[PDB]
Amino acid sequence: MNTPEHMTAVVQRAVAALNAGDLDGIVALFADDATVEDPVGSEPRSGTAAIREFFANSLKLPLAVELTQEVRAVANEAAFAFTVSFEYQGRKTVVAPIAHFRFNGAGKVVSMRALFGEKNIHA
Template sequence: MSTDIAVLSQATMKRACEAYIERTNAGDAAGLVALFATNAVIEDPVGSPPKRGTEIASWFADSVAFGARIFPVGPVRGSHSNEAAFAFDVEFTPPNGVRLRIRSIDACRFDEEGKITSLRAFWGPDDICPAH
């Protein structure tokens, strides 16, 4: 268990993850950015170059432009620390015009204010397919 900061409630972390889903589906890039701490890092997918600062806002703007929609495949899961994870399918249409689906599990770490400091998305080449 982390000793750096007080452990957040499960409800706080789960609400933040649910807000991430809702704001993605609403096309709310600014609302998505507001869920993240100023020093946040996004690694989506794990193994790709981390996104920080203005790269995060640009990445969410692209997600909105590509019509990203998240479909949860189970409830948000908490932890005994300041982390939560959720499994979902995301569909979007990149510039090539072919709508895709990615099956992902996102793991989020939170600061003491309930802001996301780290988002790591676990998906690989075998988790991408055409959307139907």
């Protein structure tokens, strides 16, 4: 059992870490056997390694990340809505997914699922 407070605390640390470009910080919320599937329909990315590299390439550009609503948490899972904003060769993109976490006994995240399609990327 995880406390909704704790699960919710992790989300922010994650959000803050994507904002801070803090790769060590984001990855250390993830179980050794954890997996990132982001966006959905990608083969899931299994293990600390692939997870680290996946967030490393997420950060090549500076990111602006914010929760657009209150985090939902019940049982061992977190869901939240958010925006990722960045600029590349003078063009701005705001991606707006819903992510989903599942936590294990030890407090860490064991799965991540970020759902978003073309209607969810904007300028």
